[PDB]
Design a protein around this ligand. Structure first.
Ligand SMILES: C[S@@+](CC[C@H](N)C(=O)[O-])C[C@H]1O[C@@H](n2cnc3c(N)ncnc32)[C@H](O)[C@@H]1O
Ligand SMILES: C[S@@+](CC[C@H](N)C(=O)[O-])C[C@H]1O[C@@H](n2cnc3c(N)ncnc32)[C@H](O)[C@@H]1O
Ligand SMILES: C[S@@+](CC[C@H](N)C(=O)[O-])C[C@H]1O[C@@H](n2cnc3c(N)ncnc32)[C@H](O)[C@@H]1O
Ligand SMILES: C[S@@+](CC[C@H](N)C(=O)[O-])C[C@H]1O[C@@H](n2cnc3c(N)ncnc32)[C@H](O)[C@@H]1O
Lengths: 275, 275, 275, 275
């Protein structure tokens, strides 16, 4: 289930993110700082999407290769690369299809990458269908398996500890998706027995115009995520490295202490493989 | 959406109810008592199902006509009637297809019935698709419209105030469905925005045998209900009589006071129309 | 694939057949004569449908048991039986669900029946999905397996030698379905590679009224048949008896000689199982 | 209905065509000759597919822009362009998504192209759903509307006059698809009433290997075409130019005279707009 196969979400992703520059303005300093601090040059983006963060890293002189399971989303990143094909940096940008579940065979890590990134609440898309989080563990394993020792892994997820609690996803401004075009997002929590099983969001993004004066137009699409509670993900992700890692998490790219006033919309996990 | 069209549920309903006699043993005293107390002879069963309670009322000398929207379920009640066709009582039992939504035209009440019954958590099946409980109000209206003034309406529903609260449906023994054959029931609560929208139960009933020594067999089916909170249903049902009624509700056919120790699995609403 | 599961066809079958009495008027003399001529008293109807011919045989003093795979169609025959439950003849009419494919286990022939009937182009419904006519052979075998030695089997089918040739099904009057209510029947022939694989008919039967003065209403349903060419069926059906049978075929219940002027709409096969 | 959306056909198209060089060897001389003879430099390919003929034209120094409705097929042409991005010719190759039905707005012809090509039996994919060949006429209109006056249009189609007649598509060698990997092609002709409505082909292409020694593997996909009889297409296509055109048709890129011994697998229509 690509969940993006229909292509409606991809078509308007640009409208969903809003000003990519304005979005990337946040955490660019941190991501870049972190990357450089650990002398990272080879970066693998497993959540490429339309290329938002891959493009940023490419421009910033990193050697990036981006993968994604949806060729509908990737098709836009590719489009961008071609458009800037005359730029040496972009001439060396690698964009290929791949799936976390089969990453190991999709992207030959070989020596591995200096850093791996999964941003914008991409991982939560993986379902627990098997009953046990086996799929979660496997995918989380392969992704970590792409990290060269001493390398970095930056994987995030929406704050579901809050969505599950209030039953609603935070509205408006978002560090990853900030666009006045997104008119509505309806949260749908499904709890099997007494455990949260799935959070389904239904977006309503206004396609610029979609009608002459007096008639506005919108695009509607739905995405489903597994609500990973912070504590659980921390445990899950660390386990993916068999413990040989240094773990840490930030609020919205800012330090995070449980009980703090500010409630983050996303939780960024920073893991540094050790051996 | 018959929800019973597939016929899997009907096929094993008998296994789900278990010992009908043992089930009917409960409340038979009360239902009969209540019926007689109000001199009721003409009884309409809008939730006929396989005929459990209609059959009981027939045997008890009442003049009953049973309707139901699922011809898959009704098909078993009919089967029963034929088998006992030699019994005068059963020779006068009426079984026809009908839908609460169109009852008014499906069952010509005319003068009306002395009593109407909807038992076994049948009504909760009606969805709120329209956004507003309009369908609920309409169906609840037609059903009440079949009650002769001074007549009775006995409509029940699972205690969803508890299911919604614990996220799980009560396990094991049940006054309506008590069978050791039912191995599992998985509750699935769906809350759109922050309001409970639907409760989906997934039953696992062991079909006797379904395999030689060493191999047991089961049947799996799913049913979805609108979680009507007590307070809301009391208001809804009373409104269906335009207020010309006498309302009351019992726990599991026993007096019910909010805050009482015993937590009822079902809530039985007893309404007596006045004119 | 019940093909009748949706119930649209059953709901208006009555309208499709038209005047059952006028329909049964044809071949009633022949069927009855044939039956009596071979001293048949126990008759099994494997294509019961709504009960048209079973009812006729019941009224005529035969001891009939009718089976059918569609409970949507059977549900009407049952309805009829109940309505005439006070008639001794109908009190002894047996109606049950069964499938040619599993007839042997569905209907315990035991000694077997004096005659078996499959009329109204019922058998052609069986598809050749398996690639080989295995299903046809098996079903045709079980059906024959219900015939007591010296017994009779009356199985028919539309004249597909003609439908395949003209690509269109004969219009209007029909010995089995004669109703001015049927406004249209669109034939759809599907030939895989160069062999006829399936004939799909789309019926348009006008439901009486379905609208006030000025607005008429119709019902639309589709049925699919395997186009059995005469020669092939003769071979197939005889083989079902392992050759221990006396075969013959009539046009529309009249003698049939290939090349004759009159083009039959149906082909009636009469087989007499022999030692 | 992309008909290619699933992507199974695109994934193995390469295997279906076989040796593109060997395929393109045929008619390359003619296509090129014809193009040059009319001094054509700007070529639009509306059936781009994986880029087979567009690539050939690009290499041959033409200025080509390719469009196609399936992004699953186009995605491969794009892949090819990128790989040869260092070749000036390919740096100027334009590849975009478009649909014959909306071509006029998808590809701004403006002045128009010197030549337009639709090869490999692409057009026959367009269905007649509307009842009337309106869609055929519209699409055929837009495509022609891309031809600059004095320009050329090369549109082909399988010889359905033969497929319809023999009920089977020609086997083996094919000028457009010649690969020993294609193990089977099952034709399926659907005739509504007495008119041929659709021809559905089911391909079985062996994916190289798909299993170790002893186990071979295949890929199965289906495509549906409208069987355009020669005479009809000639009329249809000419009408698309409002008669201001010079029409002609060849067998398999060789002169064609009705009744000739050789039976072409495809019919290539060559139109030269005058207006
Ligand atoms: C929220 S989008 C990413 C948006 C982009 N990263 C951003 O920040 O705007 C999540 C992406 O996850 C990808 N995805 C989901 N499941 C995947 C899997 N199993 N393997 C690889 N990619 C997957 C999808 O194709 C989708 O584009
Ligand atoms: C749980 S079953 C009843 C079982 C039976 N009362 C018993 O106690 O075993 C609920 C019934 O509601 C009926 N039902 C649901 N929607 C209906 C409608 N709109 N009109 C009539 N019956 C309806 C179904 O056909 C189904 O048999
Ligand atoms: C054309 S209808 C019969 C109508 C009826 N004979 C009459 O003359 O009005 C054909 C019947 O064949 C039955 N049928 C089809 N496939 C069957 C199967 N495999 N086993 C038993 N009955 C089957 C259907 O349920 C359907 O009612
Ligand atoms: C047989 S394939 C072409 C293969 C390629 N031209 C060759 O010669 O090998 C037909 C193509 O028609 C395209 N197609 C079908 N309907 C279309 C439409 N309405 N507009 C544009 N392209 C369409 C499909 O996407 C498909 O790739």
């Amino acid at each position: 289930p690509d969940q993006y196969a229909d292509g409606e979400a991809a078509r308007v992703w640009q409208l969903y993110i809003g000003d990519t520059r304005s979005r990337t303005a946040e955490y660019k300093a941190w991501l870049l700082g972190l990357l450089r601090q650990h002398g990272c040059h080879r970066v693998l983006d497993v959540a490429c999407g339309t290329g938002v963060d891959s493009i940023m890293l490419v421009e910033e002189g990193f050697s990036v290769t981006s993968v994604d399971a949806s060729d509908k989303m990737l098709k836009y990143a590719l489009k961008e690369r071609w458009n800037r094909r005359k730029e040496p940096a972009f001439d060396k940008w690698v964009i290929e299809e791949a799936n976390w579940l089969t990453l190991d065979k999709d992207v030959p890590a070989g020596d591995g990458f200096d850093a791996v990134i999964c941003l914008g609440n991409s991982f939560a898309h993986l379902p627990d269908s098997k009953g046990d989080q086996s799929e979660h563990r496997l995918a989380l394993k392969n992704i970590a398996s792409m990290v060269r020792p001493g390398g970095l892994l930056v994987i995030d997820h929406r704050n579901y500890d809050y969505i599950l609690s209030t039953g609603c996803a935070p509205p408006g401004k978002n560090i990853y998706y900030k666009s006045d075009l997104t008119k509505d997002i309806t949260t749908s929590v499904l709890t099997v027995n007494n455990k949260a099983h799935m959070v389904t969001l239904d977006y309503t993004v206004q396609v610029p115009g979609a009608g002459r004066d007096g008639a506005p137009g919108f695009s509607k699409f739905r995405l489903s995520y597994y609500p990973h509670c912070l504590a659980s993900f921390t445990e899950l992700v660390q386990e993916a490295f068999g413990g040989r890692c240094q773990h840490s998490v930030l609020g919205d790219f800012k330090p995070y202490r449980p009980g703090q006033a500010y409630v983050p919309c996303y939780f960024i996990h920073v893991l540094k493989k050790t051996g």
